[PDB]
């Protein structure tokens, strides 16, 4: 008979196919919390990441829409709408904090201690950076600073391992660079660093591609086009 873990994994892929991502998350948390000294497979770790990404992504999307509307009603001094719009935003922000807290607890309680290779360590520390970053996106003042510090520490830890243990064309290393650059740009408001880091990661990948190739070309290719897209956007906005 199938193991409970086999069963949960299959359910998670059913949830993915039905686009029921909150339930996907719960199936993959049952898997993660059932670990001993072993760690998740590449497939399992990616199911868990995809589930969380989707769950948080719907809220971030809603948050952005509500923030636009709020800024627009601010510009007209229309205060009773502003209050209701902020009531709504507060609700969304409470979900964002809960979601991030779920994966962040899971990361330091189960996933990061279990990581046994360079691939999985970087994968989980970048996830830790990502989730702290999503908190930073809507906080201010002291809470914001803390999220920013947490993000920077996680990304730095991930990058120390990535640059010494993964190839420059590795999708996870490239994904880390992309996000790290976005962190400097959107949270630290430092387009100078954002560009240098994105550019360096792009250039090292190109160099490796031009001399040694890379096994998984598809993934690297997409991420490096994302790095370029951000560089083009950020540097055209600078000269504006």
């Amino acid at each position: 008979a199938p193991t409970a873990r086999e069963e949960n994994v299959y359910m998670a892929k059913l949830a993915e196919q039905a686009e029921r991502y909150e339930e996907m998350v719960e199936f993959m948390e049952k898997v993660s919390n059932s670990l001993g000294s072993e760690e998740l497979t590449v497939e399992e770790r990616n199911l868990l990441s995809v589930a969380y990404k989707n769950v948080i992504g719907a809220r971030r999307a809603s948050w952005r829409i509500i923030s636009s509307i709020e800024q627009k009603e601010e510009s007209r001094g229309n205060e009773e709408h502003v209050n209701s719009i902020r009531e709504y935003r507060s609700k969304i922000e409470n979900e964002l904090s809960k979601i991030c807290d779920g994966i962040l607890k899971l990361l330091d309680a189960k996933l990061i201690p279990s990581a046994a290779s360079g691939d999985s360590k970087v994968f989980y520390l970048k996830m830790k950076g990502d989730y702290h970053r999503y908190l930073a996106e809507f906080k201010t003042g002291a809470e914001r600073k803390e999220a920013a510090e947490s993000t920077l520490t996680a990304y730095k830890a991930a990058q120390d391992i990535a640059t010494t243990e993964l190839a420059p064309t590795h999708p996870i290393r490239l994904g880390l660079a992309l996000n790290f650059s976005v962190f400097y740009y959107e949270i630290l408001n430092s387009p100078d660093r954002a560009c240098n880091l994105a550019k360096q990661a792009f250039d090292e990948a190109i160099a490796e591609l031009d001399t040694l190739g890379e096994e998984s070309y598809k993934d690297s290719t997409l991420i490096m086009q994302l790095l370029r897209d951000n560089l083009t956007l950020w540097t055209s906005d600078m000269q504006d």
Binding site: L174, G175, V182, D229, N230, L233
Partner: peptide, 7 residues
């Protein structure tokens, strides 16, 4: 301008 692309 804001809202870049992230992985």
């Amino acid at each position: 301008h804001l809202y870049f692309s992230s992985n």
